[PDB]
Structure 1
Amino acid sequence: LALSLTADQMVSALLDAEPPILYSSMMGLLTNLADRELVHMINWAKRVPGFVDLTLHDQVHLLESAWLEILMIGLVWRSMEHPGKLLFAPNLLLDRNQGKSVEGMVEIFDMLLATSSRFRMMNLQGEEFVCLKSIILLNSGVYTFSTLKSLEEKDHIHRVLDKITDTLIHLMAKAGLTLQQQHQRLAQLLLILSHIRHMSNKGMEHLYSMPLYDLLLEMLD
C-alpha cells in the first residue's frame, strides 16, 4: 500500500515507473509522438502508488484532466540542458523559430521554454521531478470528480498527495537545505504546477482549434 511506503520507497517506486523517451508536417509528427507517449503514460500511471486503488472511472477522469500537463512537464524536464530549445524527442529538437512555423504555438512554446529555464535555475533534481509529475496526476482532475464513493476516493488521493509532500521534503532535507529553505522550495515547485496547468489549458484550446474518455478507458481496463 502507498500509505505505508517510506520516503525512499516512494522515490524508488516512482523512479522505476518512469516511462521511456520516445523518438519521432510538424503537427503530424508531434501528434504521432504524443499518441505513442500516451500509451506509456497509462502504464506509468498504473505504477504511481495509490493510483490503481481508485475506481476505473476516477482513473480515467484523472488522466483525462492531466495528460497534457504530464506530456509538458516531461517535455520541460528533457529540455533543461538545451537552452532556447524544446526536446520533443532526441531526434526532434525545436527552437522558437520552428515553433513560429505553426499557427498559435509560439506563445506556449515561449511559456514551455521559460518553464525549462526555471527548472534549470532551481537545479530541479530527478527525484523531485518524479514527485511533481505524480502530484499532477493525482491533483489535476480531483476537484472536478457529493456521493459516498467520491468521499472515499478524495480522501485516498489527499493521503497519497500528503505522502508525496513528505517525500519531497525528505529529499530536500537529505540534500541539506534548512527547514526554511525546504518550505520555500516546496512552495516554489508547487507554484510551478500552476503555470503547467495554464500551459495545458492554452495547449488544449490551440489543439481544439485545428472521445478521449473512451480511449483512456480502453487503455486502462
Structure 2
Amino acid sequence: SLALSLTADQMVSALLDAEPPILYSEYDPTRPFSEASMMGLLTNLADRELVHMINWAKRVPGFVDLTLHDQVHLLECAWLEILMIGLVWRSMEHPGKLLFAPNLLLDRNQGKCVEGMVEIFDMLLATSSRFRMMNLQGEEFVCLKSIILLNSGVYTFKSLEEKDHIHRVLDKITDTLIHLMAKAGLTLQQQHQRLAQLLLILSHIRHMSNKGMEHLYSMKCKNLSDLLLEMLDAHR
C-alpha cells in the first residue's frame, strides 16, 4: 500500500538506495584461463550476485506486499534478466567490453573461450551500445530493472487480486519514467518515444535470458552452485 502512495521522486530514491553493490571476481590474471576456470569465475560471481539480488528485490516497492510463493516465482523467471541488465549497465562506459567485475573486463574474443558463449556476448554488447546511444540514466535503469522483476513472471501464474496489485505498481513505475523524462526537458512526443524504446529493449533482454538459460542448462548436463542449479531447474 505504501508503494502506491509514493511520489515519483520517492520511488526513484527508494530504488537508487536499494541498488546492490558491484562485486569483485576471484579473477587471478596469473592464469590465462581454461573453459572451466572462466566458467567458474562467472558462476561464482553470479552466485554471489544472486544473494544481493534477493535482498534487493525485497526493497522494490510493492514486492514485499506479495505472498512468498509469488516472490519465489518472479525471481525464478527474472534472475538472469536482472543479472544481464546489470552487467550491460556496468559496461556502458567500456565500449566493446563486458565489465563482469571491476577486475574482470572481457571482450568478445575472450568470450570465445567458452563454446557458444560468443553469441550471447555479442547480444550483451549490442545491448550496452544501445544504452550508450540512448544515454540511459541510472534513474531510468533502476526503473527498468524493477519492471523486469515484476513483469517477467506475471503471466506465468483465484484469487488473482495480487496480479492487479502488480499492475498497479507497474503503472506507477511507468509514471515514474515519464516523470523523469519530463524533468530532463523532453517533449510529450519525446517522452512517449523514449518510453517505448526502453521497454522494447526488455524484449531483447528476455531473449538473451532464454538463450543464456539454455547455455547454462547445457553446462549443467556436461560437467555450479546449489542456489544456481535451483534457479536453473526453474526453467525446466
TM over 0.5: yes
**CA shift in 2, pair 1:217/1:169, >3 Å:** farther
Instruction: Tell me if the contact between 1:69 and 1:200 (Cα under 8 Å) persists in the aligned partners.
Output: yes
What is the DSSP-based 3-state SS (H/G/I as helix, E as strand, rest coil) of the residue aligned with 1:120?
helix
**CA shift in 2, pair 1:96/1:52, >3 Å:** same
**CA shift in 2, pair 1:30/1:183, >3 Å:** same
What is the DSSP-based 3-state SS (H/G/I as helix, E as strand, rest coil) of the residue aligned with 2:63?
coil
Give the deviation of 1:79 after TM superposition. Answer: 0.3
Give the deviation of 1:213 after TM superposition. Answer: 13
What is the DSSP-based 3-state SS (H/G/I as helix, E as strand, rest coil) of the residue aligned with 1:2?
coil
**Identical columns (%):** 99
Question: Cα deviations across residues 72-104 of structure 1 (Å, max 9, x unaligned)?
Answer: 000000000000000000000001000011001
Instruction: Tell me if the contact between 1:168 and 1:186 (Cα under 8 Å) persists in the aligned partners.
Output: yes
**CA shift in 2, pair 1:10/1:219, >3 Å:** farther
Partner residue of 2:29? Answer: none
Which residues of structure 2 form unaligned runs of 5+?
26-36
- Structure 2 CA distance for aligned equivalents of residues 122 and 209 of structure 1: 34
Instruction: Tell me if the contact between 1:112 and 1:199 (Cα under 8 Å) persists in the aligned partners.
Output: yes
Give the deviation of 1:214 after TM superposition. Answer: 9.6
- Structure 2 CA distance for aligned equivalents of residues 134 and 75 of structure 1: 15
Question: Cα deviations across residues 138-194 of structure 1 (Å, max 9, x unaligned)?
Answer: 00011001xxx5421100100000000000000000001000000000000000000
Partner residue of 2:22? Answer: 21
Which TM-score applies when normalising by structure 2? 0.88
Question: Cα deviations across residues 51-77 of structure 1 (Å, max 9, x unaligned)?
Answer: 011000100000000000000000000
Instruction: Tell me if the contact between 1:99 and 1:109 (Cα under 8 Å) persists in the aligned partners.
Output: yes
Which TM-score applies when normalising by structure 1? 0.94
- Structure 2 CA distance for aligned equivalents of residues 37 and 58 of structure 1: 21
**CA shift in 2, pair 1:169/1:27, >3 Å:** same
Partner residue of 2:204? Answer: 195
- Structure 2 CA distance for aligned equivalents of residues 161 and 220 of structure 1: 26
Identify the range of structure 1 (176-185 vs 150-159) with the bigger mean alpha-carbon deviation: 150-159
Q: Which runs of 4+ in 1 moved over 4 A?
A: 212-221
**CA shift in 2, pair 1:111/1:218, >3 Å:** closer
Instruction: Tell me if the contact between 2:43 and 2:225 (Cα under 8 Å) persists in the aligned partners.
Output: no
